[PDB]
Design an enzyme around this catalytic site. Structure first.
Site: not given
Ligand SMILES: COc1ccc(O)c(C(=O)c2ccc(C(=O)O[C@@H]3CCCNC[C@H]3NC(=O)c3ccncc3)cc2)c1F
Ligand code: NA
Lengths: 344, 19
Positions: A43, A51, A115-117, A160, A162, A165, A178, A195
């Site tokens: 995702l 994710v 949870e999956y949104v 963060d 934006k 997120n 995030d 950002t």
């Molecule tokens: C200092 O840097 C950090 C700190 C904490 C972290 O977790 C990370 C990560 O490496 C990281 C890894 C994957 C993601 C990720 O895939 O996030 C997705 C896509 C990026 C944009 N934000 C939305 C996010 N999606 C979800 O969290 C989500 C949750 C539930 N359902 C659908 C999507 C985010 C951060 C990171 F790089």
């Protein structure tokens, strides 16, 4: 100005802090295992992992599983940030924060099953549609205002905000994901993170900073929802930074004057004038003209009708998400970085 | 216009954070 409404909130936050502290000082660890989950589809990604949509094989429920690569987190000195992420997230509880259901680790990775949104990122929709009407932006803005009121009361800065997120759920409300840069802090902190478009001036200038950075970032958000582009942009980071510290904003000619007034007070370069950082706190935002038709309790309880419900065909449907290339999840047979992530 | 300039910029994609 102060009525029984303001005392109802003070009583709720006082109780929510009690809940949060129990979980803050005694965090949950190791509540599931990798092979309890079928891995379907990515995702999204980030610097240390991705994710994935997943299916909890024994309940059949769908979740979003963050996977972080321990070695990469260490290589980039982001240990304490990824520790805060999990610790903060299993401890909070608000209608507009993504629930952390399970978390665990193995030899190579950290895992947060949330949870999956299914509604996708607000980003996706905002780019497609171009821009949101003021009523649509206010609906979303109101939820960030309440969410920040929660988080700040707990001594958390988010850092963060934006559209990337903010995710949209099945009833069209926001879930904040995030927490990678979320930190518990009394007083000031100094880390250059966030950002570029959304960084407050005090962050760019190494001045040290507080919760007030989140209120600046909301000004940017509201602006970008409303205009369809952020108030400071440019092809490379450095030029955005120059624009941000100059404190010159132009507003699109369609922005209402109420909105312009709200935004000139959120995008205040001077910390002592910024809405959110004054003596009345968040009440200067909530009591502003722009939010005069906002029923704050209606928003908290999710009984306002959302201006936009994303189309969902069924559990496990990923149509509101872009596609990414899938990587296989290798788990080494030797332990990466056990001492470093031992609290995880 | 400012929308056009934004749409032709390199920053309409998912924006990464810095650290
Ligand atoms: C200092 O840097 C950090 C700190 C904490 C972290 O977790 C990370 C990560 O490496 C990281 C890894 C994957 C993601 C990720 O895939 O996030 C997705 C896509 C990026 C944009 N934000 C939305 C996010 N999606 C979800 O969290 C989500 C949750 C539930 N359902 C659908 C999507 C985010 C951060 C990171 F790089
Ligand atoms: Na009363």
């Amino acid at each position: 100005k102060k009525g029984s409404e303001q005392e109802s909130v003070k009583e709720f936050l006082a109780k929510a802090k009690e809940d949060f502290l129990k979980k803050w000082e005694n965090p949950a660890q190791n509540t599931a295992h990798l092979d309890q989950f079928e891995r379907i589809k990515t995702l999204g990604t980030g610097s240390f992992g991705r994710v994935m949509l997943v299916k909890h094989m024994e309940t059949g429920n769908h979740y979003a599983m963050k996977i972080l690569d321990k070695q990469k987190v260490v290589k980039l000195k982001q240990i304490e940030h990824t520790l805060n992420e999990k610790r903060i997230l299993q401890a909070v509880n608000f209608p507009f924060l993504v629930k952390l259901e399970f978390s665990f680790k193995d030899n190579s990775n950290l895992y947060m099953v949330m949870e999956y949104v299914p509604g996708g990122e607000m980003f996706s929709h905002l780019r497609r549609i171009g821009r949101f009407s003021e009523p649509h932006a206010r609906f979303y803005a109101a939820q960030i205002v309440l969410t920040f009121e929660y988080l700040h009361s707990l001594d958390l800065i988010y850092r963060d905000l934006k559209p990337e997120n903010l995710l949209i759920d099945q009833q069209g409300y926001i879930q904040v994901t995030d927490f990678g840069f979320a930190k518990r802090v009394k007083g000031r902190t100094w880390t250059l993170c966030g950002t570029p478009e959304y960084l407050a001036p005090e962050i760019i200038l190494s001045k040290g900073y507080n919760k007030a950075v989140d209120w600046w970032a909301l000004g940017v958000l509201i602006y970008e929802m409303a205009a369809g582009y952020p108030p400071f942009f440019a092809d490379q980071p450095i030029q955005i930074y120059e624009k941000i510290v100059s404190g010159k904003v132009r507003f699109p000619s369609h922005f209402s004057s109420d909105l312009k007034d709200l935004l000139r007070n959120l995008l205040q370069v001077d910390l002592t004038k910024r809405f959110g950082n004054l003596k009345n706190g968040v009440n200067d935002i909530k009591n502003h003209k722009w939010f005069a038709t906002t029923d704050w309790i209606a928003i908290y309880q999710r009984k306002v009708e959302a201006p936009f419900i994303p189309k969902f065909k069924g559990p496990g449907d990923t149509s509101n998400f872009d596609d990414y290339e899938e990587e296989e999840i290798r788990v080494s047979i030797n332990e990466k970085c056990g001492k470093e992530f031992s609290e995880f | 216009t400012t929308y056009a300039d934004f749409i032709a910029s390199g920053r309409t994609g998912r924006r990464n954070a810095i650290h």
